[PDB]
Amino acid sequence: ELFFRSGFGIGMRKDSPWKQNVSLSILKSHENGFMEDLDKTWVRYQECDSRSNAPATLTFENMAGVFMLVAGGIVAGIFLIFIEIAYKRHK
Amino acid sequence: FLEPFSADVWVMMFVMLLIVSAVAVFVFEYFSPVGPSFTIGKAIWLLWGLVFNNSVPVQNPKGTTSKIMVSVWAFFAVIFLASYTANLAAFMIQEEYVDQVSGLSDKKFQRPNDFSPPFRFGTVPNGSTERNIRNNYAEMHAYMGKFNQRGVDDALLSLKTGKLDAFIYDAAVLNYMAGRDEGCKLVTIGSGKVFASTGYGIAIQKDSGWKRQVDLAILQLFGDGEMEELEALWLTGICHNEEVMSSQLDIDNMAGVFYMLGAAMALSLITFISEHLFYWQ
Amino acid sequence: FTIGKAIWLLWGLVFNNSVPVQNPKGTTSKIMVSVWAFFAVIFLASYTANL
Amino acid sequence: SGQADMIVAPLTINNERAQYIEFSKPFKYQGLTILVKKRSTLDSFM
Amino acid sequence: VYVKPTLSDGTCKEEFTVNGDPVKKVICTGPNDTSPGSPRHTVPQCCYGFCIDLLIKLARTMNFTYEVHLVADGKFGTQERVNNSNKKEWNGMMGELL
Amino acid sequence: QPFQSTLWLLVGLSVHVVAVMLYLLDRFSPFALTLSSAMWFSWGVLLNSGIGEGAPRSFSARILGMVWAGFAMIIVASYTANLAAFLVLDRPEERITGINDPRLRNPSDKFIYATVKQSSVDIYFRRQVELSTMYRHMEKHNYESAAEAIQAVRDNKLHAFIWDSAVLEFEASQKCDLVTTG
Amino acid sequence: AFLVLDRPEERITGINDPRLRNPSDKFIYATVKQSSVDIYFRRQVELST
Numbered sequence: 001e002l003f004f005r006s007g008f009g010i011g012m013r014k015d016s017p018w019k020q021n022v023s024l025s026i027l028k029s030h031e032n033g034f035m036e037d038l039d040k041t042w043v044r045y046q047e048c049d050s051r052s053n054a055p056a057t058l059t060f061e062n063m064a065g066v067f068m069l070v071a072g073g074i075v076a077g078i079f080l081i082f083i084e085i086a087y088k089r090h091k
Numbered sequence: 092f093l094e095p096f097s098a099d100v101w102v103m104m105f106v107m108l109l110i111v112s113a114v115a116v117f118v119f120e121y122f123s124p125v126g127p128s129f130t131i132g133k134a135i136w137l138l139w140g141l142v143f144n145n146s147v148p149v150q151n152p153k154g155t156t157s158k159i160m161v162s163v164w165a166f167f168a169v170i171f172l173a174s175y176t177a178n179l180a181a182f183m184i185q186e187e188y189v190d191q192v193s194g195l196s197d198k199k200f201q202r203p204n205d206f207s208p209p210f211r212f213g214t215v216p217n218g219s220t221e222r223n224i225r226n227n228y229a230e231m232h233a234y235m236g237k238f239n240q241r242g243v244d245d246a247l248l249s250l251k252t253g254k255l256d257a258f259i260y261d262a263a264v265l266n267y268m269a270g271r272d273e274g275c276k277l278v279t280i281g282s283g284k285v286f287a288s289t290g291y292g293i294a295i296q297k298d299s300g301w302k303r304q305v306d307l308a309i310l311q312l313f314g315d316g317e318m319e320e321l322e323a324l325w326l327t328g329i330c331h332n333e334e335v336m337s338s339q340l341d342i343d344n345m346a347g348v349f350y351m352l353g354a355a356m357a358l359s360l361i362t363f364i365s366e367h368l369f370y371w372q
Numbered sequence: 373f374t375i376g377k378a379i380w381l382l383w384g385l386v387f388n389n390s391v392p393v394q395n396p397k398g399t400t401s402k403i404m405v406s407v408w409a410f411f412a413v414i415f416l417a418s419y420t421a422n423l
Numbered sequence: 424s425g426q427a428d429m430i431v432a433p434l435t436i437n438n439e440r441a442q443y444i445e446f447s448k449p450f451k452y453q454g455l456t457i458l459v460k461k462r463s464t465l466d467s468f469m
Numbered sequence: 470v471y472v473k474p475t476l477s478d479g480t481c482k483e484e485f486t487v488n489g490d491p492v493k494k495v496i497c498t499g500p501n502d503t504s505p506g507s508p509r510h511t512v513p514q515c516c517y518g519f520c521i522d523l524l525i526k527l528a529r530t531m532n533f534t535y536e537v538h539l540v541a542d543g544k545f546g547t548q549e550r551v552n553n554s555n556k557k558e559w560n561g562m563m564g565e566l567l
Numbered sequence: 568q569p570f571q572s573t574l575w576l577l578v579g580l581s582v583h584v585v586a587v588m589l590y591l592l593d594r595f596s597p598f599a600l601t602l603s604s605a606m607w608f609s610w611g612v613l614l615n616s617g618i619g620e621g622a623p624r625s626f627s628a629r630i631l632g633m634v635w636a637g638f639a640m641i642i643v644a645s646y647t648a649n650l651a652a653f654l655v656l657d658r659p660e661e662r663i664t665g666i667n668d669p670r671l672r673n674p675s676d677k678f679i680y681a682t683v684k685q686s687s688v689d690i691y692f693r694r695q696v697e698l699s700t701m702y703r704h705m706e707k708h709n710y711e712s713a714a715e716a717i718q719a720v721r722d723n724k725l726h727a728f729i730w731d732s733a734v735l736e737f738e739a740s741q742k743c744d745l746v747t748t749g
Numbered sequence: 750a751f752l753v754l755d756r757p758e759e760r761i762t763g764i765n766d767p768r769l770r771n772p773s774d775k776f777i778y779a780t781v782k783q784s785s786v787d788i789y790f791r792r793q794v795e796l797s798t
């Protein structure tokens with residue numbers, strides 16, 4: 001959780017004849033939505049993310065084990081076919 | 092229903108189905124001493140039905156070897172369906188929600204009448220939210236005047252009754268009211284999104300010597316850590332701790348499975364049409 | 373269609389219909405088996421979901 | 424020291440710095456957070 | 470401390486544990502049942518429980534006899550202020566002990 | 568419960584649209600399914616009964632027979648999945664979390680909690696100034712004995728009782744409608 | 750059950766986390782030199798460790 005919730009300011013010296021009009025031009029830009037423009041174009045990008053739980057779909061790396069059993073049941077089959085005729089050949 | 096089994100798994104099952112079909116009808120059934128002819132048409136149909144909870148009428152092969160191959164395919168199909176259902180449950184158990192309303196620039200807030208049956212949003216007047224909305228959203232302000240609320244509590248109950256569907260107010264107050272709410276059924280959009288961001292300040296007489304003294308004192312509280320203690324003592328809430336809730340499966344959720352069926356209605360016509368064109372020539 | 377063939381048919385249906393059975397040749401008996409199949413579909417779905 | 428007349432940067436408003444310079448009203452409200460290092464592990468059907 | 474009425478004989482009804490061991494009981498002499506407010510009497514009840522079994526063990530291994538009674542107030546003890554006399558006094562069992 | 572009423576209708580009505588279509592799509596084809604056999608095929612696939620020996624004959628009907636088999640799989644799979652979600656995601660909770668709970672710290676008139684009058688609990692809350700708000704709420708609802716306060720929570724007259732854990736944990740075990748929290 | 754209970758844990762909950770509340774040599778956490786973070790930790794005596 002966030003702590004030390006102090007924001008970002010513009011620093012000027014103690015005299016700062018611009019101190020008052022800088023602050024008035026920052027409150028104005030919040031109300032105008034100018035700072036929401038800057039957040040959109042510089043802060044809110046969201047290249048990639050995920051949730052904490054995030055249920056995951058089953059890819060081929062997960063299901064390759066059972067796909068290698070149907071394939072192994074074919075090479076076993078093309079062997080077992082030869083026994084089938086050979087068994088029937090005797091009787 | 093599209094969520095488990097990445098599309099590469101479904102594709103490979105189809106091409107393994109064609110591989111197993113061709114081997115079982117050209118190498119296992121043709122070459123078998125025994126073996127109504129078992130063809131591709133009734134091998135695709137047999138293996139397809141096995142995958143989808145075998146319930147269709149089929150014609151099993153007569154060869155002993157081809158019966159072994161169908162049996163090792165039937166084992167794959169029980170694993171396939173057990174792992175489809177198991178992951179579909181895992182998705183349903185662990186889905187979060189998507190808020191229907193994006194923000195203060197949404198279509199509903201911009202033009203509610205031009206949209207679906209009107210969106211009822213309003214605010215307490217004579218404050219800073221109106222001053223921010225008079226100056227920024229003129230069309231919004233006119234539609235909001237008829238839905239004014241006399242106080243915060245009034246707009247809390249109007250949301251539950253249904254007279255309003257969105258209350259636009261100060262963020263810190265709304266965060267609190269959305270915090271100690273029974274049932275946790277009133278929430279702020281954007282998971283706490285704030286617009287026209289500002290803060291609460293102590294107003295002091297203009298051109299006075301106390302502004303510097305107050306400012307340094309407040310900044311000390313942040314540094315010394317009192318603000319987080321105050322936030323947990325006053326602004327905390329029950330609903331701030333955390334969700335996922337059981338939901339029914341209305342058509343809007345299941346429209347995808349019907350479109351897939353309704354498209355197979357469309358694909359059936361094209362092949363039915365293509366038959367007559369191929370039958371004519 | 374004997375009573376021992378109806379128990380075998382109805383038992384197989386309620387346990388993930390997987391055994392060779394003899395379906396009735398009537399129509400209202402076919403309707404009843406279909407009604408039992410719906411119960412059997414719900415029964416097994418609830419058993420797996422609660423398990 | 425006079426080198427700069429303004430600090431247009433993510434300068435956090437602090438009690439220490441406020442005793443010497445005049446901060447403006449915040450242009451960004453934020454706080455301190457901790458950054459740490461970040462699918463399916465189904466081995467097979469067995 | 471379970472407090473139960475005594476039989477008409479005045480003794481304690483005999484009960485046993487789940488195993489079959491006898492439940493040790495002590496004749497209390499606390500206030501009349503259903504509070505002593507209106508029916509002000511000290512009816513001898515029957516007392517047993519965790520603290521009575523520990524008291525019986527304490528008496529045996531330290532060789533003292535005892536007479537158990539229930540606190541009349543029904544309270545545990547708290548220094549309630551007496552605004553009448555600008556003082557404080559204990560109640561409950563704490564007042565009885567002091 | 569897992570399906571809505573109109574989703575039950577749409578599933579039932581789509582059986583007949585498939586059944587009628589499978590009949591047309593098979594009858595009007597170059598070189599079968601009767602109407603009754605198509606109704607049995609569609610219900611047999613959905614209900615997973617062996618009833619009916621007819622299957623679509625034409626190439627176009629078999630595609631719709633194949634997809635209908637997949638559609639009926641998802642309907643049953645998503646019934647078992649949604650039923651499982653409903654049976655695991657049944658958490659009323661909303662239970663008090665200790666003494667630092669916001670409900671206790673900032674009480675409302677709806678929520679009532681108390682302890683036994685003139686005991687260690689009373690002079691624990693009274694001693695601490697940070698618990699002053701909690702003390703006032705309990706001051707007007709404090710009970711004479713713990714048996715009354717335990718009976719009050721059973722009869723819903725009291726919502727929270729603060730007392731010794733050695734005593735409360737005995738009542739929670741002996742009485743099945745009481746639980747200790749926090 | 751396997752696909753549902755797949756959940757990692759042991760995440761830092763903030764500065765109050767017991768991992769951070771005391772310096773354990775196995776854990777390494779740091780901030781940027783000479784910033785507001787530094788003059789926040791050093792000013793407060795409670796989290797001097």
Ligand SMILES: CCCCCCCC/C=C/CCCCCCCC(=O)O[C@@H](COC(=O)CCCCCCCCCCCCCCC)COP(=O)([O-])OCC[N+](C)(C)C
Pocket residue numbers: 410413414417572575576578579580613614642643646
């Ligand atoms: C496993 C996955 C699915 C697989 C199979 C899918 C099968 C698709 C089948 C679809 C059939 C159509 C759906 C009908 C909806 C009934 C609504 C109703 O009033 O329900 C009532 C109850 O009703 C019952 O308990 C069941 C009544 C069924 C009557 C038979 C209908 C025709 C059967 C087929 C003939 C052709 C049908 C043609 C239809 C055009 C009241 O509802 P409720 O009060 O909200 O709930 C009751 C409980 N409560 C009182 C405790 C609250």
Ligand SMILES: CCCCCCCC/C=C\CCCCCCCC(=O)O[C@@H](COC(=O)CCCCCCCCCCCCCCC)COP(=O)([O-])OCC[N+](C)(C)C
Pocket residue numbers: 065068069072166169170173466467468469
């Ligand atoms: C849904 C339920 C209903 C259906 C039930 C059906 C009934 C089943 C009927 C019968 C099964 C009889 C027992 C044999 C099974 C293997 C056991 C074993 O020790 O294998 C070992 C070697 O296995 C492998 O690593 C390879 C398995 C996958 C590739 C296929 C090769 C052929 C194996 C099969 C040949 C065909 C035999 C045909 C004749 C029987 C297991 O390796 P492991 O590393 O210890 O694995 C641990 C799991 N883990 C990796 C996930 C952690």
Ligand SMILES: CC(=O)[C@H]1CC[C@H]2[C@@H]3CC=C4C[C@@H](OS(=O)(=O)O)CC[C@]4(C)[C@H]3CC[C@]12C
Pocket residue numbers: 346347348350351352354355358634
């Ligand atoms: C042979 C068929 O007839 C099938 C085979 C593959 C199917 C498609 C698979 C995926 C989707 C995405 C889905 O998206 S949705 O956002 O509307 O849910 C809409 C339906 C659609 C286009 C299916 C249409 C029917 C198929 C063409």
Ligand SMILES: CC(=O)[C@H]1CC[C@H]2[C@@H]3CC=C4C[C@@H](OS(=O)(=O)O)CC[C@]4(C)[C@H]3CC[C@]12C
Pocket residue numbers: 092093094096097098101102351633634635636637638
């Ligand atoms: C019998 C049918 O006709 C249906 C039954 C289940 C359907 C599949 C469900 C999920 C997906 C994943 C999707 O890609 S994805 O990137 O969105 O995952 C592409 C489409 C695909 C393969 C569907 C194709 C059509 C089915 C096979």
